[PDB]
Design a protein around this motif. Structure first.
Motif, PDB file in Angstrom:
ATOM      1  N   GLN A 108      -2.789   1.151   3.552  1.00  0.00           N
ATOM      2  CA  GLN A 108      -2.916  -0.052   4.194  1.00  0.00           C
ATOM      3  C   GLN A 108      -4.014   0.056   5.341  1.00  0.00           C
ATOM      4  N   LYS A 136      -7.504  -0.411   3.660  1.00  0.00           N
ATOM      5  CA  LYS A 136      -7.674  -1.917   3.468  1.00  0.00           C
ATOM      6  C   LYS A 136      -8.068  -2.739   4.752  1.00  0.00           C
ATOM      7  N   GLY A 137      -7.132  -2.433   5.551  1.00  0.00           N
ATOM      8  CA  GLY A 137      -7.280  -3.329   6.962  1.00  0.00           C
ATOM      9  C   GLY A 137      -8.580  -2.686   7.572  1.00  0.00           C
ATOM     10  N   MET A 152     -11.305  -4.785   5.746  1.00  0.00           N
ATOM     11  CA  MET A 152     -11.196  -6.310   5.889  1.00  0.00           C
ATOM     12  C   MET A 152     -11.567  -6.574   7.454  1.00  0.00           C
ATOM     13  N   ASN A 153     -11.574  -5.457   8.126  1.00  0.00           N
ATOM     14  CA  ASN A 153     -11.930  -5.530   9.489  1.00  0.00           C
ATOM     15  C   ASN A 153     -13.452  -5.256   9.901  1.00  0.00           C
ATOM     16  N   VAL A 201     -15.276  -8.631   9.353  1.00  0.00           N
ATOM     17  CA  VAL A 201     -15.174  -9.753  10.208  1.00  0.00           C
ATOM     18  C   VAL A 201     -16.001  -9.553  11.664  1.00  0.00           C
TER      19      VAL A 201
END
Lengths: 78, 63, 78
Positions: free
Chosen positions: C67, C70-71, C74-75, C78
């Motif tokens: 996790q 993944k985070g 995805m961070n 952004v």
């Protein structure tokens, strides 16, 4: 349960169905209705393929691709 | 040395199961721990509280 | 629930584990007739609690690591 307000090819192009989808995913992740972030992702990627292969879907997608959702701890836009 | 070695195990397991790591910290300051008198039971508890931490450090270096 | 991905943290798995331990030690007893506080019941129920806890912590920290990966991806977008 998404085919209630995301199938009627005139109910997609409305500007609230974007909010309905955002609230569905959010309140599912928070209130346990959608437990796993490895499962909210499948709900995203299946609702988008239901709404893309359907008359009225391009603008629903273009509207939802600006709403905020938080998966795997990292918050982002669809 | 069979019963006291065996009963310390059961009593320590019940301590580990019936109390979160925070009710235990304060039950050790109010003497209301389930088995405060038994030295064998509490020594086995202190041993198992070492093995749990052993894993929580070993695995968090392995990851 | 651990390997499906419901608990995002360690504290939530800890609390869930503890509470369900208590409620199960009661419910299964009252289903089987045995006194929930019985000394022999709590000899095989709470048998090897540290090995069970270690297995759970390991099969949950695998999830925490994936996790975090993944985070982190995805961070970093952004």
């Amino acid at each position: 349960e998404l085919n209630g307000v995301l199938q009627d090819p005139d109910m997609l192009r409305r500007p609230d169905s974007a909010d309905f989808f955002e609230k569905y995913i959010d309140n599912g992740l928070v209130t346990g209705a959608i437990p796993s972030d490895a499962q909210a992702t499948q709900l995203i990627s299946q609702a988008f393929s239901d709404a893309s292969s359907r008359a009225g879907g391009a603008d629903f997608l273009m509207r939802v691709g600006d709403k905020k959702v938080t998966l795997n701890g990292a918050t982002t836009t669809y | 040395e069979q019963r006291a070695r065996d009963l310390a195990d059961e009593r320590s397991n019940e301590i580990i199961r019936k109390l979160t790591p925070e009710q235990r910290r304060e039950a050790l300051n109010n003497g209301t721990l389930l088995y405060q008198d038994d030295p064998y039971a509490m020594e086995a508890l202190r041993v198992k509280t070492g093995r749990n931490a052993a894993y929580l450090v070993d695995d968090d270096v392995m990851q | 629930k651990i390997k499906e991905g419901v608990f995002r943290t360690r504290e939530e798995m800890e609390e869930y584990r503890h509470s369900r331990l208590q409620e199960g030690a009661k419910v299964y007893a009252e289903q089987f007739g045995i006194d929930p506080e019985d000394v022999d019941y709590q000899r095989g129920f709470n048998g090897d609690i540290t090995e069970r806890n270690i297995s759970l912590y390991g099969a949950h920290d695998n999830f925490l690591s994936q996790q975090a990966q993944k985070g982190a991806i995805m961070n970093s977008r952004v």
